[PDB]
Amino acid sequence: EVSAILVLTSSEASTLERVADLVTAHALYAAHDFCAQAQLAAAELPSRVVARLQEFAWGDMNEGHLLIKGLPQVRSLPPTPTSNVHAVAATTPMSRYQALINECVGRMIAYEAEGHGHTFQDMVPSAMSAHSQTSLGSAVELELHTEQAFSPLRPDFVSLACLRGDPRALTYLFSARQLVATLTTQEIAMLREPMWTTTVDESFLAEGRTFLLGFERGPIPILSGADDDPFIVFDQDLMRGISAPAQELQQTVIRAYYAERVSHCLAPGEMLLIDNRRAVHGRSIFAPRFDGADRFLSRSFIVADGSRSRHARSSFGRVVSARFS
Ligand SMILES: NCCC[C@@H](O)[C@H](N)C(=O)O
Ligand SMILES: [Fe+3]
């Protein structure tokens, strides 16, 4: 179903592998140095690969995502962790490859309130949150959403590198362009109106944690930007329409998603970049075993402009403090 594909040749994958040796800082404990090294080393990547990533980053008429195949094979991978607190992905060779590609596109960033501000988060199924609307769910379908729909500091891109796949775990992608193509002129105009409130994801709450922007935000529109290249903010589960027509238009978006969404089953060596302004994403049900061989993705976030979050970070810091989300 996915169209926007970059297939690395054996020679390009070998170059990536060699260029990763230039990235030596600890991804977790020296995140800024690690990301800055990746940004500099990315100049040594194959020009064909860099051109495709810069074109995708510019964004104009991009498909809302880019699937990269042919990354260097995942060797001596540790068992899939049963929880996300181990940050196992952040010390694998796959994370330096992911950093190099990410830093072509934009600046890597992390959030104190999302997976403890780890540079790379382990996206692994949770036994506890299996039936939850989170990255660690599995027994229920992860509903269509913009990453951090509630936050003005939300990432510009979501980066997912596959360490272990699950054949039943499908990633669903649906662009703002695909949505607008199914709607009437009236629905598009209403989606551009500030008719939906949104709340801070439960997972972002903590004892003594107050957000500068509160728990409930908005009303905001779902659609914005250029008529021919619209931006989307959506959260099926969290956004609430202010009126009866606003609740129905949210249902219209959901139906268009089920009818038009594209799917892809992430496999080892693959990497998916999602344009968080141009597309929404979801994930199918799958049945994890919690035996060390479960689906395991390395998630990271990208912003075009690191200055937008400077008020929320420390000097030479890559982590957005919780209260600013
Ligand atoms: N209801 C929205 C859930 C969205 C999900 O991607 C969340 N940001 C997570 O990683 O747990
Ligand atoms: Fe997500």
From Swiss-Prot:
Keywords: Dioxygenase, Iron, Metal-binding, Oxidoreductase. The keyword Iron applies. It comes from the Bacteria. Transmembrane segments: none annotated. Signal peptide: none annotated. GO terms for molecular function: 2-oxoglutarate-dependent dioxygenase activity; iron ion binding. Binds 1 Fe(2+) ion per subunit. It catalyses: L-lysine + 2-oxoglutarate + O2 = (3S)-3-hydroxy-L-lysine + succinate + CO2. Belongs to the clavaminate synthase family. 2-oxoglutarate binds at residue 295. This is L-lysine 3-hydroxylase.
